[PDB]
# Entry
Amino acid sequence: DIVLTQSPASLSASVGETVTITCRASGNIHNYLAWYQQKQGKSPQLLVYYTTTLADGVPSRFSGSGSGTQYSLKINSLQPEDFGSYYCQHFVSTPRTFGGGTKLEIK
Amino acid sequence: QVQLQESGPGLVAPSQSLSITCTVSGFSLTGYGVNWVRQPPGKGLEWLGMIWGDGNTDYNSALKSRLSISKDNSKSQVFLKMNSLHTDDTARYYCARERDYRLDYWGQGTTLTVSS
Amino acid sequence: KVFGRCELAAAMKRHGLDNYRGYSLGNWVCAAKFESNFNTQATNRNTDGSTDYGILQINSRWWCNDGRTPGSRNLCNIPCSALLSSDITASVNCAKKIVSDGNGMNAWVAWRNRCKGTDVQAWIRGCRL
# Structure
């Protein structure tokens, strides 16, 4: 299976800051990577798909980048509603797998 | 409006066979796949398997021998069946719609606890 | 000309169809398979005086002009014969005009009935691109 190594495990930041979350694949996933945001007690929500495409309704302060095996999610000017957990998932064949997750908490 | 809702027993013993239902509305099961994902308390998301619009199924490598996913297009329901339940199976189970390689809509999930 | 799946995929990618309007590349290759079987010279006459042309079977009543179809619209403003070439540029350009939003591939019945909901990525896996 293709495994995703996500880092960091946790991030402490204040509103207005810019953070980066990364996910590295153990194999080439050819841009088939999506990002999800999950708030405490809620279902995950799609943020970005196919590496760089924002899903409907998602603010432009979110941006994805990557190719080959290294992928990143950058959040510019963090806002209060941005805190929560983030996960990446690949879509090259099956089985699909998720990154271990990143907790984004406030300072 | 696209919607998915899970329904399960909540509690089961190792002797019982787990069965969870995912009822959808707003779209046809013939045009979209449905994935199953779980999340252990305080842990991350784990992919279980999926059923494509055409009926084909794919599963998590380490759980394939205990997993079974099926659906009934006419009833707009997808089913997840598990056996040989272990305590590690305790978690919240979600069904989610897949549209061209992204899970765009998710159910609220259903909590399952495995005891002795 | 009859394309191989990887060859068509590489060409479609070069013309910007990969993730066009949110549609992964496999969708376009899958649509071509079921519409024309990868044949650039493929032609099909419909009940009405219409005729579908090329690799993506573009209709002569609404998208291209062949000078035989009653009430031609020619929304892509181009000759149908131009769609029957070894170069898919014309076909792709027209297809891009047809798919104006994230639901535009429904313009191809074969795609809706035989591609949508299936592992379309299977058509391009293992291809160099």
